[PDB]
Amino acid sequence: AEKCSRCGDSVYAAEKVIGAGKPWHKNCFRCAKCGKSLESTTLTEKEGEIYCKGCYAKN
Ligand SMILES: [Zn+2]
Ligand SMILES: [Zn+2]
């Protein structure tokens, strides 16, 4: 029972995903480090949050 303050849609049981703690969407992925915008339903979640593959892409 919460509202994804990313896109702006309330959710609790749908396309939401568990970011090891925080509720998100399969597109509302916001990197915990580079804060970059990460769309699409494909990324990674860890460290109690969710990180972007774009980070591990830089190296
Ligand atoms: Zn969202
Ligand atoms: Zn990142």
Which residues are paired to 8 by β-bridges?
none
Q: How many A from CA of 50 to the centre of ligand 2?
A: 9
3-state secondary structure 23-38: EECCCCEECCCCCCEE
CA angle 8/12/13 to nearest 5° reads: 115
Q: Do residues 34 and 6 make contact, with C-beta atoms less than 8 angstroms apart? A: no
Question: What's the 38 CA to ligand 2 centre distance in angstroms?
Answer: 8
Strand locations in the chain, DSSP E?
2-4, 9-11, 17-19, 22-24, 29-30, 37-38, 44-46, 49-51
Q: Encoding tokens for residue 16?
A: 């939401």
Distance from the alpha carbon of residue 52 to the mean position of ligand 2, in angstroms: 4
According to the entry, how was the structure determined? NMR
How many domains, in total, are found in the chain?
1
Ligand 1 center to 56 CA (angstroms): 23
- State which residues form the domain around 18: 1-59
Q: Would you state the structure tokens that stand for residue 5, as one six-digit string?
A: 């303050």
